[PDB]
Every structure is written in structure tokens, then in C-alpha cells.
Amino acid sequence: FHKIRNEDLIFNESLGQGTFTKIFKGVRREVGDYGQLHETEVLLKVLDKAHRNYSESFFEAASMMSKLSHKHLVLNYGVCVCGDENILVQEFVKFGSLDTYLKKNKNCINILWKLEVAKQLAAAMHFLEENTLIHGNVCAKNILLIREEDRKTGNPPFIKLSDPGISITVLPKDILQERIPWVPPECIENPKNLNLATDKWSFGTTLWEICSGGDKPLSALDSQRKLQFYEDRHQLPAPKAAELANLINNCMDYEPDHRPSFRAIIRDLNSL
Ligand SMILES: Nc1nc(Nc2ccc(S(N)(=O)=O)cc2)nn1C(=O)Nc1ccccc1
Structure with a gap:
């Protein structure tokens, strides 16, 4: 540096x-x-x-x-x-983190905006996967909005992915538990299981955020209940705007080897 x-x-x-x-x-x-x-x-x-x-x-x-x-x-x-x-x-970055942008603007954000931001985040993660580089903390707070959408000029929004911060491989256990359901079940079992497949699960959690106007999934559950959520192998509820729910659940697969590549993810997104 x-x-x-x-x-x-x-x-x-x-x-x-x-x-x-x-x-x-x-x-x-x-x-x-x-x-x-x-x-x-x-x-x-x-x-x-x-x-x-x-x-x-x-x-x-x-x-x-x-x-x-x-x-x-x-x-x-x-x-x-x-x-x-x-x-x-x-x-x-002029417009800050995506999570607070979604909360303040959830009235004025439609399926086409969410799909463009989802495609851009997938492009970034495909780049990382091709370089076999793990991010380790994909979440809406770590997405930065460079440019707002301008339909008057046909301009799409533009995002960048921020750095991951302190690795989950060194964080205290109670912080990792509070980060359920972004941290995948195999990393709660053993933080040293951090893998490229980790980022596929968190990408799904992040799509859920993008579709839920800034809500935090499972925020009503305390840490003990978030642990039991994973033990019972639950999935997140479909967002009210459900266009991306199957992709979300496909990414949040409790079997890490079954999570789809980002190339396949981009193919899915391009079909909507
Ligand atoms: N690179 C960068 N630029 C900005 N800009 C920004 C602009 C406006 C606002 S506000 N409050 O008026 O809405 C907040 C932030 N934020 N940022 C960043 O990395 N944030 C961050 C991400 C993850 C964790 C902690 C912090």
C-alpha cells in the first residue's frame, strides 16, 4: 500500500x-x-x-x-x-452504502433497478471467482452506490463492492453469530471453512436485502435463535417482490458444493 x-x-x-x-x-x-x-x-x-x-x-x-x-x-x-x-x-463514493439507500428510497426502487444492481454485483463476484479470491463479507452495507439511476438519460445505477474488513477467521464467535444469515452455516461450524463457496451463500443473502427495501433478514431473532435457524435448516422467506426468490434460495444452499457458479448465476439473471 x-x-x-x-x-x-x-x-x-x-x-x-x-x-x-x-x-x-x-x-x-x-x-x-x-x-x-x-x-x-x-x-x-x-x-x-x-x-x-x-x-x-x-x-x-x-x-x-x-x-x-x-x-x-x-x-x-x-x-x-x-x-x-x-x-x-x-x-x-457519493451516495454511500446500499443498505441505507434501499431504506430511504424503497418507495422509488423497482424490479429493473434491483436486477441491474444484482447483475453488477454478480459481475464483480465472477471476476473474484475467476481469480480464486475470496471476499468473505458480501452484504448490502458493503455495496457502494457511485451513481443513481437517471431514466431521463437511460442511465442505470452503478455500484462498487467495498473491502471485506476484518476476516471472519479471526473475529469473536458472538460477532459471527450476529452476522447470521450472511455468514454461511459451514463457517458457523468452523470459520476456517471459508471458501469461494462462502461468497455464493452471502451473495444470496445480499440479493434478499436488495429485494427487501433495506430490511435485515432474521433481525427479530437473537443470536441463540439464529443458531437454531441453521440447525433446523430453514431458508429465508421470499421477499414481497419475489422475482429473485428462487435465485436467493439456490445460492443459499446448505451444501456448499451445490451452490451455483457465478457464471450460472449471471445466466439466470439474464433470463429475467
Ligand atoms: N468508500 C465509501 N464512500 C462512502 N460514502 C458515503 C457517502 C454518503 C454517506 S451518508 N451517511 O451521507 O448516507 C455515507 C457514506 N462510504 N464508503 C464506505 O466505504 N462506507 C463503508 C462501507 C462498509 C463499512 C463501513 C463503511
Whole structure:
């Protein structure tokens, strides 16, 4: 990763929290192309000081994805490790995370919008699968909306997939349980079962989010009941707008070897 000076970063408003992280809008002063000076809007992800021992995982997450370049993967500018903080410096996406966008705009989001966003997320995951790179935390909060749909110009929305954060292979067990049903059943059994097939299951959970206007699946269940949901081999309920429900259930297959490839997933989506 490129090293960025603390002196060149300005922290502005808080944009919320992630797992053991705090998120801020900021500005980076930099010399750009042709030697021209720029002040660039950035997203700053800050690892909690009391959790500095997760920094290896925090940064290995961002590093692995940033060794590949793709139009549907978020751009990382570098890191700032000046002094006591661990900071990931990332492109600032105008419209933020998909989960809060769906909640605030669920009135004005139709099947064609959901299908376009689903196709774009599948394209990103197909790219990862072809490169045998595991993401490990596919979810609507980790989808960023670069551009809104503009029917007046026939422009579709455009999304990017963010970095996965601290791996489920090092997180506390109670956090993994709270992440049911994004974390697949085999990873609750053994977090070291993390595999390419992990991302197929979470992709299904994420489609459910996209179809449910920002609702969180199984949010009414506490962690003990989320565990028993998997023990009883239940599936999620079909969303009210059910056009994608069969694809959701096909992806959320309790047998990891039976989950469809992303090529097959893209073929399905192209049939609707
Ligand atoms: N790269 C990036 N850009 C933005 N932009 C943004 C814009 C507007 C809003 S708001 N509150 O006005 O709706 C919030 C955020 N967010 N972001 C990001 O990575 N978020 C994130 C993802 C996963 C976990 C934690 C944080």
C-alpha cells in the first residue's frame, strides 16, 4: 500500500461505524497528474485503538483486493499509519452504502433497478471467482452506490463492492453469530471453512436485502435463535417482490458444493 502522511489528511464528519472501525469523510492534499496540487474527498476507515491487534487482518483485507483492478471494486488510495492510528484511505463514493439507500428510497426502487444492481454485483463476484479470491463479507452495507439511476438519460445505477474488513477467521464467535444469515452455516461450524463457496451463500443473502427495501433478514431473532435457524435448516422467506426468490434460495444452499457458479448465476439473471 502507498503510505500517506497524517499531515496531508483532514478528518471531517463521522459517517458511522463498522466492525471495530469508525468511518469519516475527509480531504487528502496531494500532488496529482502533471504536478498539479489537489484536495481530494476521501473515505477514512479507522481501526479502533483498543483493537489494534486486528490491524493485520484489517489491512490484509484491503490489500488482497487492491492487487486486482476492476470497475466494480472500490479503489484504495493507501494507508496512514502515522503514530498510533491505523487508517485506510479509500475513494469517497457519493451516495454511500446500499443498505441505507434501499431504506430511504424503497418507495422509488423497482424490479429493473434491483436486477441491474444484482447483475453488477454478480459481475464483480465472477471476476473474484475467476481469480480464486475470496471476499468473505458480501452484504448490502458493503455495496457502494457511485451513481443513481437517471431514466431521463437511460442511465442505470452503478455500484462498487467495498473491502471485506476484518476476516471472519479471526473475529469473536458472538460477532459471527450476529452476522447470521450472511455468514454461511459451514463457517458457523468452523470459520476456517471459508471458501469461494462462502461468497455464493452471502451473495444470496445480499440479493434478499436488495429485494427487501433495506430490511435485515432474521433481525427479530437473537443470536441463540439464529443458531437454531441453521440447525433446523430453514431458508429465508421470499421477499414481497419475489422475482429473485428462487435465485436467493439456490445460492443459499446448505451444501456448499451445490451452490451455483457465478457464471450460472449471471445466466439466470439474464433470463429475467
Ligand atoms: N468508500 C465509501 N464512500 C462512502 N460514502 C458515503 C457517502 C454518503 C454517506 S451518508 N451517511 O451521507 O448516507 C455515507 C457514506 N462510504 N464508503 C464506505 O466505504 N462506507 C463503508 C462501507 C462498509 C463499512 C463501513 C463503511
